[PDB]
Chain A
Amino acid sequence: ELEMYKSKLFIAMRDESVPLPYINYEHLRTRCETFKRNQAECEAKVADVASRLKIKLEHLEENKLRPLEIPKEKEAPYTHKFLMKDAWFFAKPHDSERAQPQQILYDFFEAANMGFMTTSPKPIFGKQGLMYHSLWGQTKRAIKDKRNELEPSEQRDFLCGIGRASKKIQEDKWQESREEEFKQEETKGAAKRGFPTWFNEEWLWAMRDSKIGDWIPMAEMPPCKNEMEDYAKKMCEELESKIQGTNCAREMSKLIHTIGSLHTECRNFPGKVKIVPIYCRGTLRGESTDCLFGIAIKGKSHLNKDDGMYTVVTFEFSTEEPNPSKHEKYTVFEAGTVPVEAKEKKLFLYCRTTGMSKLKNDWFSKCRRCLIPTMETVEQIVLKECALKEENRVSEMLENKRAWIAHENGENLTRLVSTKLKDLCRMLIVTQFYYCIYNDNQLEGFCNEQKKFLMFLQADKDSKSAFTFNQKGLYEKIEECIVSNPLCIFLADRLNKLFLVAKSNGAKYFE
């Protein structure tokens, strides 16, 4: 029972891997069974204390919390896959039998008249004009003949990548040549950009109420007892009645319907180029209608792993003039004129080649799960409020309570806009959605470090005299993970202005 198999190579394995002042494991076992401590320990401790050179850094005396270094270089472009604020949509009442995306596309080919959709072969700006002109003409006659499958031409052979891949050669034959095919590898990193100025007006557009009503497909209400189910039902109904009308709900409906359509098209048809609408569905005067924002084209996805990065071509409908700073990656053409009753303004078609991926479909197609953190946060506010006042005061608390947001541009010092708590929940669904799009590595590292500085600001609010051990490497990491994400650079700038507004009262910061 009490015998382990004393082998031969393992006993030469244990005796070799002992510490250096020891010969064998027997010597270490007899020394460790006969160990008694001493007080030369504190001499080794203090002899380790003397050769240190480390001082703590206070904050009431050396308040060096400088604002962050936003890179002063070229402005960060608009890199979201679709258009948010510059969108234009064609409407019709919805047919119940004609509901599949190909049926919606053909019914809007007769509904939105593509016969007048005349494009010049010379664009306003961009890179490639002839491929997009021939591509738009070919897909326009392809939608005309009521089949979504592009015949092989050089336009689709150039845009959605066919034959553009490296020849992966294994190391079994290599056929060496003297000073010919000199092969090696080389890495770069990522390009660095500057501060976006367009993100503010898209935030303020994203929370402004659009007259089309309900945009998000929620579900029905369960029955309620005489419990707190009245409370949960009430909070769901008020918050639901606020978030259905905003423009963020329109863009979430666009992502759900469009990426659901492209997703099932990625399942059913590999290797074949499809034509997929970019649309929504919402209630206009009670009539359930659907819209149409653009035309997306798949690029023969063979999704082996969770990566794969297939090519999506987007033709977009816009009714505002372009900009070579924001709309930098586009290939803006001109489409025509639109009668807009308040007289007949212009119509511009945008062109952009981009990519999606198989893991970056499921986190987009299920983007209805952004109403979960919002109601959690608002309910933490209200339930902490009644939990501190110990009385059922919710219905008047949702009306007589302010929330400071949105300081102005020319001045910042103690000049804030107090809004109601449900307009705060408008801003919360905007910011959770903006997390739902722009999540990369850089937003992750920036969110950890802003949790640290948020702990410093909470320490500043209550006069606790916090301290830090090294401020050099801290800003080397926060200035390390700010390169090119628009949301990361924006929230860095807004973190600096938070430091200004908190600097107007508490004393740990700079100008």
Chain B
Amino acid sequence: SLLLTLAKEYANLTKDKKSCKLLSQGTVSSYTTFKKWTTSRKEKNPSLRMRWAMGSKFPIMANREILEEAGIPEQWEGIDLWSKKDLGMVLASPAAITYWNFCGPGVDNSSVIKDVYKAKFMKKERWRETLWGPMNFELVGKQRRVVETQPVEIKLNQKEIKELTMWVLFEDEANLASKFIQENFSLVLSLRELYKGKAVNKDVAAFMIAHQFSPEKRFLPTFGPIRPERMELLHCLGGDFWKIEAVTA
């Protein structure tokens, strides 16, 4: 029943007169230069305007119906959380953020968060189970290399990743069929039994595929062995006048 909804929205937007000269006059590529119309120059002082923002009484734009579902108009001594000034979106204070964080409703979502961020929890689990030793205090230094810095086990090369996320999520407008498909299509048969029914949005799925298959290769000053497990530990293992390594396993 989604096609009736999209047909109602599409039939609603053609009711506008001057908007009909917008679409069917541009191109399919022009979506990119339709995405950016940022007529402000640079936002050249973001932390300055953020300190001026947090100094007021109501800096935040917040949803109304949820906060009138569960929040309170004022706390126990004059701490304001609400306005009635203007879509129905209501300004508020960051005391509502911390009050939501301390006296608000709770939904069990630990499995979803511990399944989207598998790369970073894998970094934490690889971080906790290491052991160090003494320093060395010697001169050290070596040139710049192109190093893949993540312990992936698939090692794609940033071309079958965009193509792979075309041929796993949404195949109706995916790609022309190349010769890079077949064995990766056995992997597609593996992946469609994973991302079939989930509450994860397709942009978040398109995020979470691209970080388990992509060894992040950057142009970095390295030294010693060039194993990719110790390349997120690049900045910790040695500097220019000092060095520390005692990893047994």
Task: Indicate yes or no for A touching B, C-beta below 8 A.
Answer: yes
Q: Which residues of A are interface residues toward B (Cβ below 8 A)?
A: 225-228, 231, 263-264, 267-268, 306, 362, 383-384, 386-387, 389-392
> Which candidate, B12-20, B60-68, B131-139, B162-170, is the interface stretch facing chain A?
B131-139
> Which candidate, B23-31, B192-200, B236-244, is the interface stretch facing chain A?
B236-244
Do B241 and A226 have beta carbons less than 8 Å apart? Answer: no
Smallest Cβ-Cβ distance to A391: which chain B residue: B137
Residues of B within 8 A of A264 (CB): 51-52, 55
Q: Which of A267, A306, A362, A392 contacts B137 (CB 8 A)?
A: A392
Interface residues of B in 114-163 (CB under 8 A from A): 132, 134-135, 137-139
Decide if B3 is an interface residue (CB 8 Å cutoff).
Answer: no
Known: A228-B242, A264-B55. A390 touches B137 (CB 8 A): yes
CA distance A267 to B53 in the complex (A): 9
Residues of B within 8 A of A263 (CB): 51
Do A386 and B45 have beta carbons less than 8 Å apart? Answer: no
Decide if B48 is an interface residue (CB 8 Å cutoff).
Answer: yes
Do B132 and A225 have beta carbons less than 8 Å apart? Answer: yes
Q: List 26 A-B contacts (CB under 8 A).
A: A225-B132, A227-B236, A227-B244, A228-B242, A228-B244, A231-B135, A263-B51, A264-B52, A267-B55, A362-B45, A362-B48, A383-B240, A383-B241, A383-B242, A384-B241, A386-B137, A386-B241, A386-B242, A387-B138, A387-B139, A387-B242, A389-B137, A390-B137, A391-B137, A392-B134, A392-B137
CA distance A391 to B242 in the complex (A): 11
CA distance A231 to B45 in the complex (A): 35
Q: Is the interface of B mostly helix, strand, loop or mixed?
A: loop
Q: A225-B132, A362-B48, A390-B138 are in contact. List 17 more A-B contacts (CB 8 A).
A: A226-B132, A227-B132, A227-B236, A227-B244, A231-B135, A264-B55, A267-B52, A268-B56, A362-B45, A386-B241, A386-B242, A387-B137, A387-B138, A389-B137, A390-B137, A392-B134, A392-B137
CB distance from B244 to the nearest CB of A (A): 6
CB distance from A397 to the nearest CB of B (A): 11
Binary interface encoding of chain B residues 223-246 relative to chain A, with 1 for a CB under 8 A from any of its CBs, else 0: 000000000000010011110100
Residues of A within 8 A of B242 (CB): 228, 383, 386-387
CA distance A306 to B137 in the complex (A): 47
Do B135 and A387 have beta carbons less than 8 Å apart? Answer: no
CA distance A391 to B45 in the complex (A): 46
Do A228 and B135 have beta carbons less than 8 Å apart? Answer: yes
CA distance A386 to B239 in the complex (A): 13
CA distance A467 to B135 in the complex (A): 43
Residues of A within 8 A of B45 (CB): 306, 362
Smallest Cβ-Cβ distance to A230: which chain B residue: B135
Q: Is the interface of A mostly helix, strand, loop or mixed?
A: helix
Residues of B within 8 A of A390 (CB): 137-138
CA distance A268 to B135 in the complex (A): 52
Residues of A within 8 A of B244 (CB): 227-228
Residues of B within 8 A of A362 (CB): 45, 48
CB distance from B20 to the nearest CB of A (A): 31
Smallest Cβ-Cβ distance to B139: which chain A residue: A387
CA distance A392 to B243 in the complex (A): 12
CB distance from A53 to the nearest CB of B (A): 45
Q: Which of B55, B138, B236, B241 contacts A268 (CB 8 A)?
A: B55
CA distance A392 to B138 in the complex (A): 10
CB distance from B165 to the nearest CB of A (A): 32
Residues of A within 8 A of B52 (CB): 264, 267
CB distance from A266 to the nearest CB of B (A): 9
Residues of B within 8 A of A387 (CB): 137-139, 241-242
Residues of B within 8 A of A228 (CB): 135, 242, 244
CA distance A263 to B242 in the complex (A): 43
Residues of A within 8 A of B239 (CB): 383
CA distance A389 to B138 in the complex (A): 8
Known: A227-B244, A386-B241, A387-B242. A392 touches B135 (CB 8 A): yes
Smallest Cβ-Cβ distance to A226: which chain B residue: B132
Smallest Cβ-Cβ distance to B55: which chain A residue: A264
Smallest Cβ-Cβ distance to A382: which chain B residue: B241
Residues of A within 8 A of B241 (CB): 383-384, 386-387
CA distance A206 to B184 in the complex (A): 69
Binary interface encoding of chain B residues 53-91 relative to chain A, with 1 for a CB under 8 A from any of its CBs, else 0: 001100000000000000000000000000000000000
CA distance A231 to B241 in the complex (A): 14
CB distance from A310 to the nearest CB of B (A): 15
CB distance from A362 to the nearest CB of B (A): 5
CA distance A264 to B49 in the complex (A): 11
Interface residues of B in 40-54 (CB under 8 A from A): 45, 48, 51-52
Residues of A within 8 A of B138 (CB): 387, 390
CA distance A417 to B138 in the complex (A): 32
CA distance A389 to B132 in the complex (A): 23
Smallest Cβ-Cβ distance to B48: which chain A residue: A362
Which of B48, B55, B240 has most chain A Cβ within 10 Å?
B48
Smallest Cβ-Cβ distance to B44: which chain A residue: A306
Smallest Cβ-Cβ distance to B135: which chain A residue: A228
CB distance from B241 to the nearest CB of A (A): 4
CA distance A271 to B190 in the complex (A): 67
Smallest Cβ-Cβ distance to A266: which chain B residue: B52
Residues of B within 8 A of A268 (CB): 55-56
CA distance A392 to B136 in the complex (A): 8
CA distance A434 to B45 in the complex (A): 25
CA distance A164 to B133 in the complex (A): 69
Residues of A within 8 A of B132 (CB): 225-227
CA distance A390 to B52 in the complex (A): 50
Which of B45, B51, B236, B244 has most chain A Cβ within 10 Å?
B51
Residues of A within 8 A of B139 (CB): 387
Smallest Cβ-Cβ distance to A394: which chain B residue: B137
CA distance A383 to B132 in the complex (A): 20
